[PDB]
Design a binder for this molecule. Structure first.
Ligand SMILES: O=C(O)CNC(=O)C(=O)O
Ligand SMILES: [Mg+2]
Ligand code: NI
Ligand SMILES: [Zn+2]
Length: 331
């Protein structure tokens, strides 16, 4: 078995190997990358996402989200308070202000320490979940707006044609902005490109051990667990590496820098934080190997998770028994 310790693997494809996206994902899996839940892909030196980032300031963040924490430093939830719209230039200036800017630090490990010590005492503002793309239309390789769609994959594997679309999302971050512990909708893959700015630190649980994280989460968030049998789908709970280690949960960590891709694999729980002002683009995708995970994915039916239009068909075709209850949750 390849990668039996489930370490995060880092890949350096050549420009030739960067042509065929599906083929390269399958290669990475042949080497055991999926066992970690997360892999890093450093693009060939010849590649670029677009020519410059000099003209992005007028993108609108219609609903910036202030991420307010509750709990203790290593075990907390966050809720998202909606703020007034602002442009990316306005958000960048806010990220760089004395109130929100990254503190002085020695290195990524020192910054990580400071994040876990102090996150809960601040409420950073995240420009998350903005439909759009920063890839130039002429970028032919690993262009996250030009990937094969999940609907087409389902149709190719299973023969059933379904409605829905699959487009990317932009994330404008600042110091301490946080992504809570989650797997993707329908335990899909994700791919995330850090276009510019400061790093993003990731934590990940191997897919084979995901249920250990779920059992811990039920213990640490006991009211949430009574409310919903899949409350991590709400994407609000944080648990620190120190608490994971104290509870014997297997995990790994890695820091993504500008110019790098990350791939999350089906049922790979992940969480993390931004170091400072940055912009990432991410999208879900599927492969043949996903289908079995999609059929088994948990679902939130309490009403909280509320998701895209395109998840309807995935539930309806892959999980017909669950469909009625899940759809009630959506309505
Ligand atoms: O970058 C973020 O805030 C969150 N991203 C992801 O969870 C992902 O790409 O799968
Ligand atoms: Mg602009
Ligand atoms: Ni994710
Ligand atoms: Zn729920």
């Amino acid at each position: 078995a390849q990668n039996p310790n489930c370490n995060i693997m880092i890949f350096h494809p050549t420009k030739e190997e960067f042509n065929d996206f599906d083929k390269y994902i399958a290669y990475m899996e042949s080497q055991g990358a999926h066992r970690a839940g997360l892999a890093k892909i450093i693009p060939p030196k010849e590649w670029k996402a677009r020519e410059t980032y000099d003209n992005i300031s007028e993108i609108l963040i219609a609903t910036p989200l202030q991420q307010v924490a509750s709990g203790r430093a290593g075990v907390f939830t966050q809720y998202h308070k909606k703020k007034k719209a602002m442009t990316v230039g306005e958000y960048r200036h806010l990220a760089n202000s004395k109130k929100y800017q990254t503190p002085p630090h020695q290195n990524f490990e020192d910054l990580e320490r400071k994040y876990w010590k102090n996150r809960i005492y601040n409420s950073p503002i995240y420009g998350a979940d903005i439909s759009g793309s920063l890839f130039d239309e002429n970028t032919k390789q690993w262009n996250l707006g030009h990937l094969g769609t999940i609907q087409d994959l389902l149709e190719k594997e299973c023969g059933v044609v379904i409605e829905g679309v699959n487009t990317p999302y932009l994330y404008f971050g600042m110091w301490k902005t946080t992504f809570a512990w989650h797997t993707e909708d329908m335990d899909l893959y994700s791919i995330n490109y850090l276009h510019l700015g400061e790093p993003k630190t990731w934590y990940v649980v191997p897919p084979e051990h995901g249920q250990r994280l779920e059992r811990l989460a039920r213990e640490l968030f006991p009211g949430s667990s009574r409310g919903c049998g899949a409350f991590l789908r709400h994407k609000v709970a944080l648990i620190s590496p120190t608490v994971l280690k104290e509870n014997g949960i297997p995990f790994n960590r890695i820091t993504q820098e500008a110019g790098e891709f990350m791939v999350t694999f089906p049922y790979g729980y992940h969480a993390g934080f931004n170091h400072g002002f940055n912009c990432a683009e991410a999208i879900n995708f599927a492969t043949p190997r996903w289908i079995d995970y999609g059929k088994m994915a948990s679902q939130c039916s309490c009403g909280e998770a509320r998701v895209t239009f395109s998840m309807d068909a995935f539930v309806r075709i892959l999980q017909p028994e669950r469909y009625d209850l899940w759809k009630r949750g959506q309505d």
